[PDB]
Amino acid sequence: TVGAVVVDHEGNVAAAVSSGGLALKHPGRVGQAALYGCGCWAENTGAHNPYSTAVSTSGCGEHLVRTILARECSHALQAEDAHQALLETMQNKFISSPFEDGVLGGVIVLRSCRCQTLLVEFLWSHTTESMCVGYMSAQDGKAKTHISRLPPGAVAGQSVAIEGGVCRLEGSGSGGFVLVHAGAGYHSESKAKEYKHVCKRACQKAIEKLQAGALATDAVTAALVELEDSPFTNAGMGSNLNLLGEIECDASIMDGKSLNFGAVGALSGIKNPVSVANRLLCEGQKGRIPPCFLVGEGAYRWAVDHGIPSC
Amino acid sequence: TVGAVVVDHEGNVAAAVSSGGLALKHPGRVGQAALYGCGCWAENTGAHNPYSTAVSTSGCGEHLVRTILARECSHALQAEDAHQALLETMQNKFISSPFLASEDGVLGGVIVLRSCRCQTLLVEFLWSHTTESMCVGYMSAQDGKAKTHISRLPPGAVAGQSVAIEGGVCRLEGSGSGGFVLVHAGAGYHSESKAKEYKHVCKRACQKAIEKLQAGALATDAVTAALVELEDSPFTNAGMGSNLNLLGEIECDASIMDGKSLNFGAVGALSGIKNPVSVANRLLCEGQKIPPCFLVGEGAYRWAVDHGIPSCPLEHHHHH
Ligand SMILES: C=CS(=O)(=O)N1CCN(Cc2ccc(OC(F)(F)F)cc2)CC1
Ligand SMILES: C=CS(=O)(=O)N1CCN(Cc2ccc(OC(F)(F)F)cc2)CC1
Ligand SMILES: [Cl-]
Ligand SMILES: [Cl-]
Ligand SMILES: [Cl-]
Ligand code: NA
Numbered sequence: 001t002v003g004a005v006v007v008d009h010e011g012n013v014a015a016a017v018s019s020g021g022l023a024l025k026h027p028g029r030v031g032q033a034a035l036y037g038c039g040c041w042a043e044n045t046g047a048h049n050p051y052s053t054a055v056s057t058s059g060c061g062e063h064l065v066r067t068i069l070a071r072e073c074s075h076a077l078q079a080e081d082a083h084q085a086l087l088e089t090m091q092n093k094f095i096s097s098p099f100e101d102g103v104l105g106g107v108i109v110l111r112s113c114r115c116q117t118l119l120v121e122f123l124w125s126h127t128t129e130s131m132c133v134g135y136m137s138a139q140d141g142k143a144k145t146h147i148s149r150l151p152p153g154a155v156a157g158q159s160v161a162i163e164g165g166v167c168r169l170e171g172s173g174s175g176g177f178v179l180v181h182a183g184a185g186y187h188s189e190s191k192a193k194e195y196k197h198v199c200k201r202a203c204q205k206a207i208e209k210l211q212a213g214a215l216a217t218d219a220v221t222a223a224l225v226e227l228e229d230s231p232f233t234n235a236g237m238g239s240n241l242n243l244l245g246e247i248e249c250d251a252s253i254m255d256g257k258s259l260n261f262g263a264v265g266a267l268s269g270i271k272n273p274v275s276v277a278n279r280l281l282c283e284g285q286k287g288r289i290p291p292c293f294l295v296g297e298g299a300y301r302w303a304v305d306h307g308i309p310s311c
Numbered sequence: 312t313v314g315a316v317v318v319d320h321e322g323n324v325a326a327a328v329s330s331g332g333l334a335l336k337h338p339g340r341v342g343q344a345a346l347y348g349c350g351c352w353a354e355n356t357g358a359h360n361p362y363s364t365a366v367s368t369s370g371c372g373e374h375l376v377r378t379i380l381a382r383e384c385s386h387a388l389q390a391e392d393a394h395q396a397l398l399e400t401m402q403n404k405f406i407s408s409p410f411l412a413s414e415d416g417v418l419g420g421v422i423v424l425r426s427c428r429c430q431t432l433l434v435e436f437l438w439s440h441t442t443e444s445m446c447v448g449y450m451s452a453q454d455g456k457a458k459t460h461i462s463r464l465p466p467g468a469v470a471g472q473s474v475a476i477e478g479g480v481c482r483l484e485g486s487g488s489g490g491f492v493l494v495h496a497g498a499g500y501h502s503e504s505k506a507k508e509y510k511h512v513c514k515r516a517c518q519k520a521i522e523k524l525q526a527g528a529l530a531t532d533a534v535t536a537a538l539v540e541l542e543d544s545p546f547t548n549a550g551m552g553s554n555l556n557l558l559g560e561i562e563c564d565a566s567i568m569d570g571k572s573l574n575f576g577a578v579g580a581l582s583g584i585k586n587p588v589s590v591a592n593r594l595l596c597e598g599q600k601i602p603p604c605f606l607v608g609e610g611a612y613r614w615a616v617d618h619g620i621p622s623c624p625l626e627h628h629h630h631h
């Protein structure tokens with residue numbers, strides 16, 4: 001699973017997620033990365049929502065589904081202390097949730113507010129051994145990547161790691177901020193450099209999109225395309241094969257300003273599943289309500305009919 | 312769309328929902344009846360949950376997804392006043408949701424029950440809808456006569472902008488094999504024509520659920536038996552008689568949740584299976600015995616056949 005969250009120079013947020021799902025899964029099994037509220041969430045500041053918030057989740061277990069995790073995190077991040085809010089959520093759902101010996105997953109989040117300046121707080125958290133993240137603001141111009149690990153002595157699925165930072169943006173240009181992740185799971189010293197490199201490239205693509213004036217959803221899509229294309233990520237190319245040796249992808253994207261959503265489940269034969277999810281969202285804005293969630297052969301046919309490259 | 316909610320004599324709740332989805336929909340479009348939190352919800356009483364609650368939805372698919380309505384209703388029903396909680400949710404979280412602010416009119420409905428022990432069980436059941444009408448049926452094991460009712464928006468209300476809400480309370484003896492069921496056969500335009508037919512399938516659906524309960528079956532097996540009967544009606548947009556998609560083909564969504572285990576099963580874009588809810592229930596059942604909870608399309612069909620759920624291969628499509 002890979003994901004990204006974006007805030008543009010106006011404080012509009014977006015989030016996306018993409019996955020190959022469980023290795024050897026039964027054909028047609030659709031997981032959290034396709035499910036509204038579970039895989040990602042993005043919601044601009046509103047009446048009962050003082051922060052514009054964007055969340056993308058990772059893991060395996062179904063625990064991301066069972067708790068409607070991304071939306072849960074977004075709602076918890078309305079509390080004053082974001083670090084404490086995220087930690088409490090991870091602790092209650094990935095250890096003590098009523099909804100198993102150990103719960104494995106991860107999340108990236110950001111929340112912004114107007115101070116014209118934008119205060120962006122961004123965090124990542126995981127109960128897996130490790131998680132690779134990258135982040136970048138349009139004004140720093142150098143993507144930062146980092147491999148987050150559980151401390152020495154910790155036990156995956158029984159402890160929570162959480163880190164983050166703060167970024168202050170000028171709301172006057174074509175800038176913004178992006179945070180990505182290339183997966184949460186077992187630590188691998190050997191491919192650490194490759195994970196960091198793809199997170200670096202994914203951030204640079206998202207920032208370049210913002211700097212050309214693109215929507216937050218197009219910027220978060222450009223990040224996920226880069227993350228998908230890495231043979232090392234369980235999304236797009238290199239997705240885990242299912243029980244029959246075939247690739248079936250889940251992906252979704254949400255726009256914080258319009259609250260619109262796009263998703264695909266059990267999608268085969270398309271190089272970049274997030275591109276189809278984004279196109280479903282984009283066609284939803286143009287619009288009977290157009291579909292937001294397509295699966296299987298119907299999703300493939302719709303992607304091809306809309307000119308999304310196949311593999 | 313059809314749905315049912317059940318509570319057994321112990322306060323164990325279950326909920327299920329089944330739909331054919333939107334007429335002429337693009338192949339592979341999956342709606343609220345397959346989606347966790349959206350189509351149905353069931354949650355027994357627990358630490359931060361004084362009531363066992365069960366919810367099933369109806370109506371336009373995309374409005375129910377964007378608002379995650381079934382789960383929202385279940386959480387609102389933890390408040391003291393269930394009638395007030397449901398009405399506020401329908402008004403504030405559904406009609407006036409910012410998630411549907413672009414839409415002219417918000418169309419949908421819910422059935423709910425919640426129970427608590429006062430050994431006797433107090434069951435409160437309600438239905439609410441923003442559509443012109445909604446057909447419900449309900450029954451307790453001790454009354455032994457199913458009641459059916461077509462709920463309508465009052466004169467002066469505007470469909471998609473007004474809320475209708477009714478319900479009642481039922482006290483069960485928690486010493487037998489009893490319980491209570493509430494079903495619905497659809498929410499949408501009033502049709503005097505098939506009004507009697509919808510009422511009749513709701514009555515039979517309640518009777519099947521109660522008979523299951525009286526035979527000692529789990530709440531999930533009783534709610535599934537209600538939905539099987541509701542699906543089988545040629546007049547409901549679920550199972551047999553489901554709306555045809557853009558290619559003239561059948562693609563069904565269905566899901567079920569168990570309040571005791573909090574486990575969930577669901578199918579989307581399923582073709583060639585007579586009773587989609589049976590596959591959702593079997594997924595939930597095999598999950599109790601990481602097992603899948605949500606299968607779609609070709610894989611969902613193959614899984615159903617491999618588990619002995621009655622199929623019609625002539626209704627199944629698999630394009631390449
Ligand atoms: C069940 C989950 S999964 O099957 O979606 N998946 C399998 C593939 N994994 C790759 C991966 C990526 C980053 C990472 O972090 C590190 F780079 F080491 F810092 C570790 C592993 C992620 C989890
Ligand atoms: C559910 C969403 S649907 O779009 O799948 N659907 C299409 C099928 N309809 C049948 C139906 C059932 C009951 C009813 O109520 C009345 F009996 F009139 F009281 C009216 C129509 C419901 C709307
Ligand atoms: Cl599986
Ligand atoms: Cl459609
Ligand atoms: Cl009546
Ligand atoms: Na990949």
Ligand code: NA
Pocket residue numbers: 541542543544545546547548549550551552553
């Ligand atoms: Na039917």
